Amino acid sequence: SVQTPIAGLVELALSDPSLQDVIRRAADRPADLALVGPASARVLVAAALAQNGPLLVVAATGREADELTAELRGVFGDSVALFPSWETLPHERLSPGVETVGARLMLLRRLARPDDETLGAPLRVVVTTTRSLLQPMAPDLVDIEPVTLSVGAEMEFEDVVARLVDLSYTRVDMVGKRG
Amino acid sequence: EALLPLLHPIEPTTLTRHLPEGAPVLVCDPEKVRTRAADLIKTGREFLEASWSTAAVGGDAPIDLEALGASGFVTFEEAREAAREGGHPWWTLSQLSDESAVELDIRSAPSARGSQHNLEEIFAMLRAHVATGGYAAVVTPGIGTAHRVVEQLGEADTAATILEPGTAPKAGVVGVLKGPLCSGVVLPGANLVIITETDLTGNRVT
Amino acid sequence: LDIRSAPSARGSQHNLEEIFAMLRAHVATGGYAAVVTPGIGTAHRVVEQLGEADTAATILEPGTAPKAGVVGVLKGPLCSGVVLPGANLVIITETDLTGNRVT
Amino acid sequence: EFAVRGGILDVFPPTAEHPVRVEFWGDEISEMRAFAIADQRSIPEVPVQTVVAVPCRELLMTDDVRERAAALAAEHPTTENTVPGTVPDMLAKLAEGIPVDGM
Amino acid sequence: LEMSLAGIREMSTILTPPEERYPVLTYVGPHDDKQVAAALRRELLRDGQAFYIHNRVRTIDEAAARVRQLVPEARVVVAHGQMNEETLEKTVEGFWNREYDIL
Amino acid sequence: ARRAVREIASELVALYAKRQSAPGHAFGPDTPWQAEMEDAFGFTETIDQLTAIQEVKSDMEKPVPMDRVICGDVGYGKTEIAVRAAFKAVQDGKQVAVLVPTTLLADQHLQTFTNRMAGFPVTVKGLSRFTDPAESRAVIEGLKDGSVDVVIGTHRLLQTGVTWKDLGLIIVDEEQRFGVEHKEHIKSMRTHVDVLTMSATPIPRTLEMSLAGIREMSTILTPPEERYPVLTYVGPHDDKQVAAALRRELLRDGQAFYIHNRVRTIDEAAARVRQLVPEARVVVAHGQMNEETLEKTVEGFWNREYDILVCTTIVETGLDISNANTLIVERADTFGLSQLHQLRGRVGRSRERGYAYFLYPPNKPLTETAYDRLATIAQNNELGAGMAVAMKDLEIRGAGNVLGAEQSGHVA
Ligand SMILES: Nc1ncnc2c1ncn2[C@@H]1O[C@H](COP(=O)(O)OP(=O)(O)O)[C@@H](O)[C@H]1O
């Protein structure tokens, strides 16, 4: 397809019997599975495990998460997504980027509701960094109901503006930035 | 949010809980992930003690830094234990070799960085590979950059076809493709050889 | 000059097997292959590795030239190897195979 | 370094592996043998050929350098309370002819 | 002015970013030494550098001294207008070549 | 005194006899892997080292539990004997431990044990002060199941909560620096299992053959590679010379010891160092810090995070930073001959040439004994002027580390 340009090439790469051996070994869910290979093989091995179902992939730094995330976008499209890391520390007196927070909560809701097509395709590979892997989070964040806006929906206006106000949306007289 | 364990006191949960049940966790380069993780714990420690020091907070009772330790970074061992206790296997992929490891039959593509003789040796490597009947493919993130590689392939005793997106190469001809790939891969088990233009010019074009 | 540097297997044993494979192909053609190891007690180890990689190896007599058709493990002072295709010669150092410098 | 004893001169040239002891008789060397630093006893299994004791500093201690070391030594005399590492001591010992550090 | 002076001079304007460049996170508040130390160390953790601005030129050296007291692992240097261009330009050449850590 | 020494000899010979009649599983000859591990050595074994390995292997093979010392200078290669003996004990199925006084040595010996014993199914693990309590409480301490074949650890291995499963060999390094309680602990372990100690301080040979029956000690005097002497400069404290020397040592990406024993002013002293070399990462270290901060700072200096370490003599003499090969002794007149020699020895051990700067203050007239002393070390000489006279002092505390008595009352 047009979204995944190198899907067939990764299919041909997965014809290799060692990757197939990784499929067979990962099928019965072993406790320990240690794999050794070059860096360029990451996208392959990930795409290997994705053959058995969804999975999380933790890269070292954020740059590796972006690189591998794009490489996996070349094979899965919108099915693979990235869980970005905070720009600040959990107890630093600075809020992280509104776009990073939005991507985090949006990915968490996409994981919670894979069938909701308005959020995107169901998730296959979720790539992140060590930061977002370790840094915990409140479990009630996915329950926060977002504001769904579609042409033709029946919503009263004051409920919409009040709901956005409750979602930490800054009310201005002229939209310039996100949030 | 820095005051979240004191404003919204709910026992936090890790990221691995939100994953679908049974979804494995693949940690790439586990040692760099480990050391870096330690560095995050040290840094968050420092920012917690600094931004919320009783000398700088205020006049009455302090903020109970131990209470704010809950949302702090979770150590590597605890993240592995919670991920395993949630039904998510903790699998690793390292670059350093190990005797007790499933060493994949996968090797990196030859990078001709800083050598046009090695570059012609890469074109000729693809030439000998496709003369044997092997699968060769060139992944180029640039839109239209694949055509120049095609011309140089038909020019240097090779066959190049702009493979349509989402397709695998056929034997005998090199299949130049557009897509996102940083470094190439050589798989002799699948008779496949994938070269990126990063390997040809030594340039990362994300 | 028509001289190319040696392939340095970083330590990933697939690169090691690949290097021993290109040595096997070079000596199958008829070219000269030499593995120079400055360390004492590491030449026999390279002979064993080549035997596991199915390659004919020989610890060369000090001062000789590698015989055509057999890889010659040699004990001599070298840092990094050199590939001379004009002389049909491939010299690979122990340093390139193990990533360590013997002083 | 070198040590002087009755009819026996011990000397350690800067280029020789083992220090050499030479036995003089009259006006010519009677014997030569290399010894060990530890026990100060001779090593007979090391054959000693002609040894060439080259200088140990990149200079020669002539009378002219003592003269100029006395002209320069005239200024900054500091006759009393000579500091160890200063230049009155250095130039004073150069006028006295003995080699010193930093010369 | 771009439209009025278009007859004698042509002007292009690049308003579109090259990629997704993010707005910096700005924190205003009281000068806390521990916060500055933690921030500079965080910038040092990615092998980055930091600009420390101190306009008072008579205390800029003392300011850099206090900064090094806050973070000993930082390589801090000063650069101001009272310096001659020859020293300042070399200081900048060092700060660009990662010879220092905090300017 | 003659009545005060036999009390010591009693404990000595009683330990030798309790060791002689004790039941301990001897160690068989070297297995096939031992040859490959010994030949994976990067360098070349030395004759004193080969004889030492033969003696250590034989004492392990003899039914009497081993109690042997290894005497040699810092930079002569006894740690290789440690790793080879530990490997030999592993091949017979017995897990081993290595006891170090400071955590830095636990990390250094940990990395050497990793590199020398890599490629074999041998999990090495260490328990320092900075090992997180998760891995510590779980992996390291919980390794009474044969999970660890060799553990490098600090004094935390001597608390009550520890327990071993078939402890086969104990390796002690710098036994003098341990605490008294820890010392009696290790001596309590001596009778039950094989021990093997390493020492950088020499002993008088008269004591070596005087106490040869109770405790065998092997000496290494063959240098593994010619460690050329450091270049010493005695002189007045000039800032330009200090800065120039520090920048030269920084050129080869090296590190330097700056010594300012007056703790009260050490901070200010370091500041003045930063006045001379602004691009230098300068840190302080002294015994008044709690060990949790001090060992972290010294760790940062060993991990090349800092370039110049201002410290006191207590801290400097006891570190093995191979990358540090330049020494600055401010107020060199205040130090004794022995202390100056110890300070100097801690630099210039690796393949790099070391430099030392003994500086006296120029604002006050130097004393007569400082003039004489500084003159002895000035012309660098191994003669009987004092290098040997102050070498005996280096052997006094060595004897104190060998025998149980510390009191110098009967000696004086
Ligand atoms: N035979 C040798 N030749 C040269 N260097 C050696 C030799 N053996 C060990 N070394 C080096 O010297 C150090 C060995 O000594 P070390 O392990 O520090 O213990 P010690 O200093 O007590 O002997 C190591 O850093 C090692 O790299």
UniProtKB/TrEMBL annotation, chain F:
Locations listed in the record: Cytoplasm
Helicase ATP-binding domain boundaries: 59-220
Signal sequence bounds: none
Every Helicase C-terminal domain range: 238-395
Domain of life of the organism encoding this protein: Bacteria
Transmembrane regions listed in the UniProt entry: none
Role summary: Couples transcription and DNA repair by recognizing RNA polymerase (RNAP) stalled at DNA lesions. Mediates ATP-dependent release of RNAP and its truncated transcript from the DNA, and recruitment of nucleotide excision repair machinery to the damaged site.
Family (UniProt): In the C-terminal section; belongs to the helicase family. RecG subfamily.
Name recorded for this polypeptide: Transcription-repair-coupling factor
Species assigned in the record: Mycolicibacterium smegmatis (strain ATCC 700084 / mc(2)155)
Designated gene of the protein: mfd
